[PDB]
């Protein structure tokens, strides 16, 4: 049986403030820039539709230097931090970014048509761009988040598999890391393994996995450590309706239509796909630059940061403007030529985080020791995530008890 943390955790009246100064990231919005001979990255990939996972490290309160010590007994008490307030400051102006493919697989525009496509070609690919759906989300926890996507499965060995067959599909749960791609209006699938022509989705997702958070599995966890708080807001609509070009994997049944003649002797493509569009960004619909108070979590864990560790996941596509840069090769010409200038694309992104923490103490009795050991063995030993990449935040040297000297501390003292 799982019990709430409010039973075996005692909260004191000591509060601390923590915060980062400013985080910046500048890079190419579509692909990394790499040296031709080498494999070392010169310009990383920074996009507005990437998961931002911050892993925050806290001081050990047992070894922390407090002006007063009489409030607890080190012989039978142990200390831990609790989160009571978070703000995610978000710079840059509001904007919308677009992406596309120079060789995207589009056959025809089927929204309105007046002639029939009676002849097939060798290459019908086009240069198409669009803007993605609108999404904001924030997740806070003490364990890394969990996402889901569609991937290939293991086929049965009863019958053989011929080239060109439909791959089998299964649903896969993984851990979201820093730099992953969010859904853009095409689904949560592995585009590298489920698409072979490399020309069906834009350039920044054509060789990546799009993942969606697994809210149902996260909230059903018995201990509720992976999610203390979450906000989400997403929207989209359809702008264009197209076809796809290729060979027909599955034929239309003969009892759904009447055969034609002349131009309509053969059938056109039935692999319709839409073009997504986020509508419009406004200041009134923003979930950032606002303080969140963590009064009572939904799960049994109520903001206790076991292991001196915090995880913050952020997605915000409402500031995704890409900047165009131009450099002149030769300036000794008074008439414009296309070949005298070079074009570049850049994206910059700005972050700020600030937190209010409360000090708690735990009495280690035999029953409490047994329960905590059953919950997590490493906690007692201290008194794994080495193959994942997160944005590391080190707050071991940024705490202050002067709570009213900071913007978030003033609000915290004002609400109470």
């Amino acid at each position: 049986k799982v019990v709430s943390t409010d039973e075996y955790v005692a909260r004191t009246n000591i509060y601390y403030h923590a915060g980062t100064s400013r985080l910046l990231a500048v890079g190419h919005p579509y692909f990394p820039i790499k040296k031709p001979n080498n494999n070392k990255i010169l310009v990383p990939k920074v996009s507005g539709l990437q998961y931002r996972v911050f892993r925050i490290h806290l001081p050990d309160p047992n070894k922390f230097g407090f002006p007063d010590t009489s409030f607890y007994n080190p012989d039978t008490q142990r200390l831990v931090w609790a989160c009571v307030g978070v703000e995610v400051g978000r710079g840059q102006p509001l904007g919308v970014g677009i992406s596309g493919h120079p060789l995207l697989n589009k056959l025809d525009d089927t929204e309105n048509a007046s002639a029939y496509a009676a002849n097939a070609g060798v290459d019908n690919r086009e240069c198409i761009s669009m803007d993605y759906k609108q999404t904001q989300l924030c997740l806070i926890g003490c364990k890394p988040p969990i996402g889901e996507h569609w991937g290939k499965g293991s086929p049965c060995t009863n019958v053989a598999v011929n080239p060109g067959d439909c791959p089998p599909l299964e649903l896969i749960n993984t851990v979201i890391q820093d730099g992953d791609m969010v859904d853009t209006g095409f689904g949560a699938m592995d585009f590298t393994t489920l698409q072979a022509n490399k020309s069906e989705v834009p350039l920044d997702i054509c060789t990546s996995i799009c993942k969606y958070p697994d809210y149902i599995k996260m909230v059903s966890e018995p201990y509720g450590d992976s999610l203390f708080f979450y906000l989400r807001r997403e929207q989209m609509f359809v702008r264009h309706l197209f076809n796809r070009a290729g060979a027909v994997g599955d034929n239309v049944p003969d009892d759904l239509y009447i055969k034609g003649s002349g131009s309509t002797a053969n059938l056109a493509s039935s692999n319709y796909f839409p073009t997504p569009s986020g509508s419009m960004v406004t200041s009134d619909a923003q979930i950032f630059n606002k303080p969140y108070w963590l009064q009572r979590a939904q799960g049994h864990n109520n903001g206790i940061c076991w292991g001196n560790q915090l995880f913050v996941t952020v997605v915000d596509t409402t500031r995704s403007t890409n900047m165009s840069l131009c450099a002149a090769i030769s300036t000794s010409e008074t008439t414009y030529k296309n070949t005298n200038f070079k074009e570049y694309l850049r994206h910059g992104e700005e972050y700020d985080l600030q937190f209010i923490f409360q000090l708690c103490k735990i009495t280690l009795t035999a029953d409490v020791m047994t329960y905590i050991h059953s919950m997590n063995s490493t906690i007692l030993e201290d008194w794994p995530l080495k193959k994942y990449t997160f944005w590391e935040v080190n707050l071991k040297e940024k705490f202050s008890a002067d709570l009213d000297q900071f913007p978030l501390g003033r609000k915290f003292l004002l609400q109470a």
Epitope: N119, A120, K259, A265, N266, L267
Partner: antibody
Framework: QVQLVQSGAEVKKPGSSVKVSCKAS????????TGWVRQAPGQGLEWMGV????????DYPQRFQGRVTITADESTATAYMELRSLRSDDTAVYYC???????????????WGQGTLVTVSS | DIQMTQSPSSLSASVGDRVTITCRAS??????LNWYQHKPGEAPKLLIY???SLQTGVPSRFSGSGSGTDFTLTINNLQPEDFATYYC?????????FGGGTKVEIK
């Protein structure tokens, strides 16, 4: 240029099934539409079936539905024709007609096989 | 399906003559007609497609014209290599069909 090569002559008994192949040898083909024709001793030409893998088309005449199957393999560029429930009137010479992608229509059958003789008798 | 009728079924001509073959369709098939030439011991060979267009590598002495339900093939200045069997073919629907065939012979 490209040449289509067909399998050898077949001798079958009534009630059996036969299968004939058609392979493109020179260059790279990238076939467009495949069809089969036949000629009986002392008769004309009879269309027996067409497949157009693009557009997903597969059509056979009414008198031949249920006994004729036409298949194409793009990895090896080989066409196959299957006849079931052979009769004594199926003794004939069979021709493989194919069209290449990049032409102006699907019915520009400019490539033909040499023909295969099939004799159904006991 | 569509039935096609080819006339005549046989004719005799001499070198240097003009030969016309008429082809009639059971329905309106626009210009979806092709003409094929067949010789003994060889595969059929395409001459005219879409009832007007001339296949590459074919002498200009061959011509074809028609539309609707009536079509015709004309051969001017007949040569010794033109003596073969000629067939219609409709491609209006994906269930294609052939004509009866006309055999040209030596007078």
């Amino acid at each position: 240029q490209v040449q289509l090569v067909q399998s050898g002559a077949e001798v079958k008994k009534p009630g059996s099934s036969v299968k004939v192949s058609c392979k493109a040898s020179g260059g790279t083909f990238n076939s467009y539409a495949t069809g089969w024709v036949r000629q009986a001793p002392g008769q004309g030409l009879e269309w027996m079936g067409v497949i157009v893998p693009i557009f997903g088309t597969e059509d056979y005449p009414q008198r031949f539905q249920g006994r004729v199957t036409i298949t194409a393999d793009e990895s090896t560029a080989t066409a196959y024709m299957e006849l079931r429930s052979l009769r004594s009137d199926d003794t004939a010479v069979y021709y493989c007609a194919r069209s290449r992608l990049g032409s102006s229509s699907w019915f520009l059958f400019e490539y033909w096989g040499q023909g295969t003789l099939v004799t159904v008798s006991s | 399906d569509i039935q096609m009728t080819q006339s005549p079924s046989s004719l005799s001509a001499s070198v240097g003559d003009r030969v016309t073959i008429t082809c009639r369709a059971s329905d309106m098939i626009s210009n979806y007609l092709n003409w094929y030439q067949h010789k003994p011991g060889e595969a059929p060979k395409l001459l005219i497609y879409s009832a007007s267009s001339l296949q590459t590598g074919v002498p200009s002495r061959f011509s074809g014209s028609g539309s609707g339900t009536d079509f015709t093939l004309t051969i001017n200045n007949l040569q010794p290599e033109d003596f073969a069997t000629y067939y219609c073919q409709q491609s209006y629907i994906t269930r294609l069909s052939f004509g009866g065939g006309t055999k040209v012979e030596i007078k």
